[PDB]
Structure 1
Amino acid sequence: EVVVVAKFDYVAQQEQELDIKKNERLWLLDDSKSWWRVRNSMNKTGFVPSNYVERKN
C-alpha cells in the first residue's frame, strides 16, 4: 500500500464506496485491477474485477 492523494471530492453512492475529499491522503490497497460496479438478479451490488464481466458485443 502506497499513500495517494484525492484529486476531487467523491460522495459514496453505495455503502461499498468511500467518501473522500479533495487533497485527502489515502492508502491505496489495490490498484492491480480495474474493478467494476455490478448488480445481480438477486438485487445485490458490489465490485468485481473487470475481466470477470462479459458484455455481449
Structure 2
Amino acid sequence: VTLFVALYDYEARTEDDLSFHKGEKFQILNSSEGDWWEARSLTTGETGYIPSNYVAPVD
C-alpha cells in the first residue's frame, strides 16, 4: 500500500513540511517512527513531511 489521499488541506509550518489540498494524492513508501511521514505529491511532484493523520490509503 503506498498510495494515500489527503483528507484535509494543510499549510506547511516549515520548509521541510509539504503543503497540500484535500483530495491530493501521494506516494508514501515507508511510514516513519513518528506522526510525520515523508511523502511525494503525485500532483506537484514535491516532497516533504506531512502529518500522518491527514491522509488515508487510497481505496
TM-score range, shorter chain: 0.5 to 0.7
Q: Higher relative contact order by CA 8 Å / sep ≥ 6: 1 or 2?
A: 2
Separation in structure 1 between the aligned mates of residue 26 and residue 4 of structure 2, nearest angstrom: 5
Q: TM-score, normalised by structure 1?
A: 0.53
Map of 2:7 onto structure 1: 7
Q: Over the residues paired in the alignment, what is the CA RMSD in angstroms?
A: 2.4
Q: TM-score, normalised by structure 2?
A: 0.51
Give CA-to-partner distance per residue, 1:20-54, whole Å, 9 cap, x none.
11010111133141156xxxxxxxxxx8xxxxxxx
Structure with greater strand percent: 1
Instruction: Tell me which structure has the larger Cα radius of gyration.
Output: 1
Unaligned runs of 5+ in 2: 37-48, 50-59
Unaligned runs of 5+ in 1: 37-46, 48-57
Where has structure 1 moved over 3 Å in runs of 4 or more? none
